């Protein structure tokens, strides 16, 4: 469990929220 799909899933997200 590297969390590759659980780390871009929380940062690509948090980044898309600030820009919206």
- Give one DSSP letter per residue of the chain, joined into a string: ---HHHHHHHHHHHHHHHH-
Distance CA 2, CA 18 (A): 26
Determination technique for this entry: NMR
**Cβ density class 1-20: b for 16+ within 10 Å, e for less:** eeeeeeeeeeeeeeeeeeee
Distance CA 15, CA 8 (A): 10
Length of the chain: 20
Distance between alpha carbon 7 and the CA centroid of its chain, in Å? 5
Q: Residue 12 to residues 1, 16: CA-CA distances in angstroms? A: 19, 6
Q: Residue 8 to residues 1, 11: CA-CA distances in angstroms? A: 14, 5
């Amino acid at each position: 469990n590297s969390g590759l799909s659980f780390e871009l899933l929380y940062r690509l997200a948090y980044t898309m929220v600030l820009h919206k």
